[PDB]
Amino acid sequence: SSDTPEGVRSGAGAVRDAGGAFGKKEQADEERYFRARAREQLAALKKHHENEISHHVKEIERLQKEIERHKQSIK
Template sequence: MLSIRKVTSIAPVIRFARMCTGEWGSGAGKGGGGGGTIRDAGGAFGKMEVAHEEEYFYKQRQEQLHKLKENLIKHEDFHEESIKHHEEAIARHKKAIEGLKKKK
């Protein structure tokens, strides 16, 4: 014999999930946050703190990228200079070899 189960609504689960999620700085929960940091407290100050953190890390990433680019340019210059010196050395050696061949 088959039994038919009563299907319950998932509305309470969705409602709970909406309460738990939110944007950064909106607070730790309905109780007004954990009482710790400004970010946990929520509200305008929490959102402002998130904006400051994001700005700080954005500037830090930009500075790191700038230093990386400068470092790569220095490496490129170094290698171009090395190539130039090697080509000059090759030319000197070829000239010395030609001089030795003429003496034979």
């Protein structure tokens, strides 16, 4: 009874709207993934938080070389 506007139809994202045993098979499945990516990315925050100083560091060295050029021009 779906090929008619009078016959009722369903929405998008209604499986988790019921609250059955597929809505809790999916609410828990998402926590068993996005809890273990939360410590792949909590461990690599030691490195890249030092790398953003290393990039800044890189820039600093570059700018000091330019200064050096100007200082030699003056000389």
